[PDB]
Amino acid sequence: VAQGPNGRALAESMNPDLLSAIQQHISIERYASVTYLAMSIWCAERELAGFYQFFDGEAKDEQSHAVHFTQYLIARSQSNDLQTLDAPRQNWDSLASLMATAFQMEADTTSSIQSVYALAERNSDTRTTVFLDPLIAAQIQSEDQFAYLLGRVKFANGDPTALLVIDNELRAGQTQRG
Amino acid sequence: VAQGPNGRALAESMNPDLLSAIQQHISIERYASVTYLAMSIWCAERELAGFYQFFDGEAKDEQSHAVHFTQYLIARSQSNDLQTLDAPRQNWDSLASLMATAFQMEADTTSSIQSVYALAERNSDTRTTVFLDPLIAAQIQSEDQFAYLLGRVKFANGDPTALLVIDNELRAGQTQRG
Amino acid sequence: VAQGPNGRALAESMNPDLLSAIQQHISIERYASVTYLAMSIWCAERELAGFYQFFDGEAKDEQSHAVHFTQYLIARSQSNDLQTLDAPRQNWDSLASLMATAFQMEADTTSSIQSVYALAERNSDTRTTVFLDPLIAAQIQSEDQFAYLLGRVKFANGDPTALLVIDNELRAGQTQRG
């Protein structure tokens, strides 16, 4: 029985480029987390309490996703390498603009997973593609959700009355098409 | 004991023109169903989740109505003839325009029943008029309901804020005058 | 942030051939639905009430599958295109022959998914393969189930007594090997 790079018994070696890609992706999830925290603060600063609560939860969830990936590296007997985290964007001119950055951040998180997926397929790493499959499934739902929130906010067309209504929807937990 | 056209024991023969009218009406109900599906999709594409949920349910209900008619033909020992279904309308310029098509579709479904009813009366088919009576009753309620939804949407006069409020009413199941 | 063809924010563009393949597949599911409705009617016409109830449920389930696909196109910000639906087959010489068409219809539904799957893989659309994976899983179970029902009916070898026994199994919900 061989030892993997993190010292645990090794079920199958992992290509170093794939390892690097996963470690990088963990940073993407952590960065999405602190981005959503920054968005939650921006909303709180403007009394958009429902949007604040929503993004506060998204920040915690994105962190959980990151930890989920660190557990996979542990399971694969690979080393983690927690990286420097950039500061998030913190200023937007409107809620519509914030929600556009949010949607983009969610789509970019999926693209990151997609590139890890493609690398695993090139390396015939079926453990990794299997591991990623439900995460892609969840990304589809999150993209659908953020397209919903963005589109609803854009429909409001900057009217504070409509934005207050949507804010109250979010506070109530009405955050998807259902 | 004689056999009816579908092979079952025949309680009373049905006029072929009336049979044809019922088979055609089944197509009308199936077409209303796929129309409401198309409307549900249009609403989902614009984040009008309450309207989406409403029309999703209406589509399933209209299909149930169609099946209800197929069961009557079985009960009358008559053949069904499930027909080619046209593609639904799928594009509208506004929710008000969609709701107008919806109201028209509901009124046209009733007119179809009315013409079957008149044919049955001409043929003294009391089983059929009795069978249709509660369906007309339900059509009155549906017409009242769709007049309510259409009128409420028109009252909104295209204001997104009012349309979001109505959308939330529909998501909550508030779909009639009550 | 770009807009997709259905107007929603676009997380990732979809190849038009893949879009066409999915829209076509939706028609396959809708056609399986109305086929199972026709089969339910054929069974009802011959007093095979358990088979009638079974196929009535299968028709509703196949429709749900179709709607499930329309929701995916919405989630991908792609347009739906609900198509003309052909009339189903409606005449069979025996229950064994009906069950053979049913099994074939189920296998053909899977083949349709398989061809969409292969197109998505050619286009590296991992959202779509992930979306399809559980549907293939369900198809395996449905194929196993329909092979069971077909084989059991063939074992009966046209004996009405055995077919009445199987009919009662189906009415009771005994529809799989378990």
Next chain:
Amino acid sequence: VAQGPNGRALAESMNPDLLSAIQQHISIERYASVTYLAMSIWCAERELAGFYQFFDGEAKDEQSHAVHFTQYLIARSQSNDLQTLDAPRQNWDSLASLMATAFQMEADTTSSIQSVYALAERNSDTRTTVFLDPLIAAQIQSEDQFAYLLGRVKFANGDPTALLVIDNELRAGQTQRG
């Protein structure tokens, strides 16, 4: 306030031909009742206990229908005239033949109602057509049910094994397509 023929206050006079038709129809229901009793006995004599229980219940139900009509005449302030009841048919060569007489008896009961209905319409007696409407509705269900039982028995093609299976269905209360 005028008195009706049975001595009660009269809300609206009834045409004597319509009265006679209703009194005659009551006899039809009473005759169906004793016919089903005779059928229940025939089945009991051949150990077809499920068919016996079914027809025993049908006999009681048909009597209830007759009494329901006597209550309508009372409500209309009209006299009842309970008539001589013919002896029922009591001999059949097979269960299939009995079930054919049963189906015919049910269809003939509906025809009787239909002729009363037509007379009421000729006389513009809307109370009577309204009164008859749910009874026609129930007749449709009974015709569907008896077509089911007859067809299932004919499918058995005289095989005692299949007839024992159907007998047990009836004992269990499985008497319709459902």
